[PDB]
Design a binder for this molecule. Sequence first.
Ligand SMILES: NC(=O)c1ccc[n+]([C@@H]2O[C@H](COP(=O)([O-])OP(=O)(O)OC[C@H]3O[C@@H](n4cnc5c(N)ncnc54)[C@H](OP(=O)(O)O)[C@@H]3O)[C@@H](O)[C@H]2O)c1
Ligand SMILES: NC(=O)c1ccc[n+]([C@@H]2O[C@H](COP(=O)([O-])OP(=O)(O)OC[C@H]3O[C@@H](n4cnc5c(N)ncnc54)[C@H](OP(=O)(O)O)[C@@H]3O)[C@@H](O)[C@H]2O)c1
Ligand SMILES: NC(=O)[C@@H]1C[C@]2(NC(=O)NC2=O)c2cc(F)ccc2O1
Ligand SMILES: NC(=O)[C@@H]1C[C@]2(NC(=O)NC2=O)c2cc(F)ccc2O1
Lengths: 315, 315
Amino acid sequence: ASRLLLNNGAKMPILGLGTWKSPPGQVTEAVKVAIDVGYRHIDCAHVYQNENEVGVAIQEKLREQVVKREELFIVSKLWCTYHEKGLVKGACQKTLSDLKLDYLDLYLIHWPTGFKPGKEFFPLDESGNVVPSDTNILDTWAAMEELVDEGLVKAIGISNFNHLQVEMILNKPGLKYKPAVNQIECHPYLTQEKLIQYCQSKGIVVTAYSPLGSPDRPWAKPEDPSLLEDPRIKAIAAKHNKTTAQVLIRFPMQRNLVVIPKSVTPERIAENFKVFDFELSSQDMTTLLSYNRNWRVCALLSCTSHKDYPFHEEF
Amino acid sequence: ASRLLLNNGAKMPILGLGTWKSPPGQVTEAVKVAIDVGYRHIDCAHVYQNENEVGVAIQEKLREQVVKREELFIVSKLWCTYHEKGLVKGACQKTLSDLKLDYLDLYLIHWPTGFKPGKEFFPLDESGNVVPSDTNILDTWAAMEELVDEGLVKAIGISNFNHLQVEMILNKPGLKYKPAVNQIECHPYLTQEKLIQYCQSKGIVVTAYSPLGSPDRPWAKPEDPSLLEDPRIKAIAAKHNKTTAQVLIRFPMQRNLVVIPKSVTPERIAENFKVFDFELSSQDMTTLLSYNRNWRVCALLSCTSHKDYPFHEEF
Ligand SMILES: NC(=O)c1ccc[n+]([C@@H]2O[C@H](COP(=O)([O-])OP(=O)(O)OC[C@H]3O[C@@H](n4cnc5c(N)ncnc54)[C@H](OP(=O)(O)O)[C@@H]3O)[C@@H](O)[C@H]2O)c1
Ligand SMILES: NC(=O)c1ccc[n+]([C@@H]2O[C@H](COP(=O)([O-])OP(=O)(O)OC[C@H]3O[C@@H](n4cnc5c(N)ncnc54)[C@H](OP(=O)(O)O)[C@@H]3O)[C@@H](O)[C@H]2O)c1
Ligand SMILES: NC(=O)[C@@H]1C[C@]2(NC(=O)NC2=O)c2cc(F)ccc2O1
Ligand SMILES: NC(=O)[C@@H]1C[C@]2(NC(=O)NC2=O)c2cc(F)ccc2O1
């Protein structure tokens, strides 16, 4: 199955290109190659600091006629700093302006944690912790529903919301629109079994980010495990004659998740796409599921003491 | 959901109206009432022999501009006797003339076991066993695929096919169209766990039939079980204040199977549609799934010796 049906009836492609860490000059050729390769799903976000450059690529392919706008699935996110109702719309409008679009297929609240409104993405205080916003999660969803009603975003989702937080959006009195997706970190070390199960039971679509363990994350330490270099998984890639990266993408796909591997390497963007012609066995699925360490790659450490920090619960 | 997504773009209505056993003297009002109520999916077959009286109901509500052909999802199936590659094309046409439709949304090969061409639906040899045709299943699949190129049917599929029979069509050399749906028997007594997951893995939608156990089946014996009377199932219903039949239709929808209950009674047709306003619990589901006793209502016993009789394989 190449696409998942969402709540709004939209068909969301099961595989997308990640743009976090993709430098400005490199993201353009990368979005282009992706599209040429077959990727019709692209993952953006304001804090990634390259949406503008990503947009130039999509514009070039539409001009070149390789794609019609209704063939791509553009996703973006609301940074924790524009959580305050009156700031939401304006932020959506900047993402659209940069990407050079009329509407976003899906717009997500980037984190359950809202930050102090300001120029800087991470308004740190005197102890290295984030200066929290006053904002409550509900008004924000309410601010997000207004975008759908205005026809600026086809769908609205959540990202990094634990099952408790998810639940409250679901029970908010007078709810108009239901979370379409909940993009969460997921790979062999963070299998997210319970949360995936909850989201799916509530009809929400789960999108796995950092599928390859995010080798390039700024804070990586040369002592942490490395999924691309885990011998046990090289073992499985052997039997399929695919790369670990290909087996690390098939994995969430077979669990029914959208996967969004990142890469600015033309050769790799293609390698990551050839994953529709093979199947990890049931035991392969079972094997990779046992590799769980509850090991997070993106844990937003500066917000461990924020009222809405998502990761203190079991899920 | 309320409409599923097929491997061709289509979205198939989650609930349909069955028409096996509905006498022609009542199938027309049956369909008409169903449409009014809100059904946009009717399940038909040539062997049901009321395909003409169904067409009338369609034709009538279409002219009253109550619904558009664009909105309906009419389904029919190829009788065992037209398995010969030459007969397919015309058998389909016969269906379109009866139903008075210019194309079908989903046409299924009723059974994996074709019989000898003739005016009889069940050509019984001396011993009451039925006479088969030396036809080749992929070849029939070939004729089905041409209905799609021809523009006659929007999608094609299979019914009563085990995993080995399906898999042989998935590997067919130069396969143009792939099984959109697999209509199989499914209810608490025959839960269909292995096949159902085999299928959903292939991106093949499943359609459960005889969802209420088929109490009207000609071959019912007093000793046989009664899903609707089952006091255990009655308890789940009781809890949700809904009724057994409603519980039983909800059952497949929470497993991602479209379900097609049959009824020629306008009161039950309305009732059976009122199943989107409640939810069976994780336990209710576990409860209902454990009732399975590998009990089948449709076993095509006259074909147990047919080269292709589907029910010898585990799944
Ligand atoms: N909503 C959120 O809160 C959230 C959080 C985190 C991430 N995300 C989304 O998820 C995306 C994916 O996560 P991620 O960027 O952290 O990391 P990732 O995709 O797991 O890993 C990216 C790294 O893997 C390399 N790589 C990619 N394909 C490869 C291949 N076939 N062989 C070898 N190396 C390969 C990349 O190299 P090159 O780039 O050099 O090719 C890059 O160093 C993000 O970009 C973002 O769009 C969303
Ligand atoms: N592909 C295949 O091989 C295949 C095989 C069998 C069936 N099917 C399809 O699946 C459909 C459903 O299966 P089925 O006909 O075997 O039987 P079913 O749907 O399990 O049950 C039909 C019986 O249930 C009764 N009923 C319906 N709604 C009811 C309600 N709310 N309360 C109480 N009784 C209710 C009907 O009575 P009234 O009509 O008198 O109300 C009838 O006696 C078929 O009609 C056909 O379209 C496909
Ligand atoms: N440590 C974290 O959890 C986040 C992860 C995260 N990446 C991502 O895609 N979403 C994020 O919020 C991110 C992105 C940045 F541009 C800067 C920091 C940053 O840290
Ligand atoms: N015993 C069986 O398996 C089938 C079931 C079946 N009902 C059904 O919907 N599809 C079938 O083929 C059926 C329908 C008939 F009109 C006549 C006989 C008949 O027997």
